[PDB]
């Protein structure tokens, strides 16, 4: 019923995991030159923290996908700490009297739409991860709550609209059945966690975040590319024989040595 890209090969059973965020608001008031002061508080301070809490991210997508990827989020870092950034976004606050919200917002604006102007995947990629970085620092400096995903317990299947590097890097590859997400796949970072880790994976999903609720019952086949939503038990008690008995084929591929 419902066909995804088809990242990797294998079938998996597991609850559906939905993950709800919570939207983040811009305020358009405008400022006047008396509380502009205090925006730089927010906005210094807050990049006081918002640095810590990227340098610990960065180690975990070092220990995770090892040094090769650590490069990559060590730039991200770099353009936070860009002098030049920093004065620009400083001048919108003071100059065009713009909350520390809402002047980072522009800023973000152009940093990210210039990478899309460059035809190189890595450079473009950059365009949506550095995306990322502006939303993160909106949410420190109005002290929106972080989830941790880190923290699961039960093996189940994760779906999401889409999963961004950083989560990626802090993401549990051991407690996770498989990544079920909205994105597109042709060069797509989750394509990369599945490529590397070889576990069964669906990109294309389109709206299926839109369809699913947690709890909700769902199979992976990755061999057909389709996914069964609250399929009924007869159907299963079907599968699981049949579908089971796939697997026994696949470890004679793995023992070549008995042949």
Same mark, same amino acid.
């Given at each position: 019923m419902i066909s995804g890209i088809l990242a990797s090969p294998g079938i998996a059973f597991g609850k559906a995991l939905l993950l709800k965020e919570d939207e983040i608001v811009i305020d358009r008031k405008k400022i006047s030159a008396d509380q502009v002061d205090q925006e730089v508080e927010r906005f210094l301070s807050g990049r006081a923290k918002a640095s810590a809490q990227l340098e610990t991210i960065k180690t975990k997508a070092g220990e995770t996908f090892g040094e090769e990827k650590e490069a990559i989020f060590e730039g991200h870092i770099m353009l936070l700490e860009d002098e030049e950034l920093e004065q620009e976004i400083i001048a919108l606050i003071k100059?065009?009297?713009?909350?520390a919200d809402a002047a980072a917002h522009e800023v973000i604006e152009g940093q990210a739409s210039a990478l899309e102007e460059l035809d190189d995947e890595y450079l473009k990629e950059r365009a949506a991860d550095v995306r990322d970085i502006g939303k993160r620092l909106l949410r420190n400096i109005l002290g929106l709550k972080i989830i941790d995903? /880190?923290?699961?317990?039960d093996e189940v299947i994760l779906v999401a609209a889409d999963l961004t590097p950083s989560e990626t890097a802090q993401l549990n590859l051991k407690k996770v059945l498989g990544f079920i997400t909205d994105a597109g796949g042709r060069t797509s970072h989750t394509s990369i966690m599945a490529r590397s880790l070889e576990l069964p994976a669906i990109v294309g999903?389109? /709206?299926?975040t839109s369809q699913v609720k947690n709890d909700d019952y769902l199979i992976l086949d990755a061999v057909n590319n389709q996914v069964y939503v609250n399929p009924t038990n007869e159907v299963i008690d079907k599968m699981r024989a049949v579908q089971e008995q796939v697997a026994s084929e696949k470890a004679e591929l793995a023992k070549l040595k008995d042949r």
């Open positions: 100059d065009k009297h713009m909350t995903l /880190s923290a699961i317990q999903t389109g /709206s299926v």
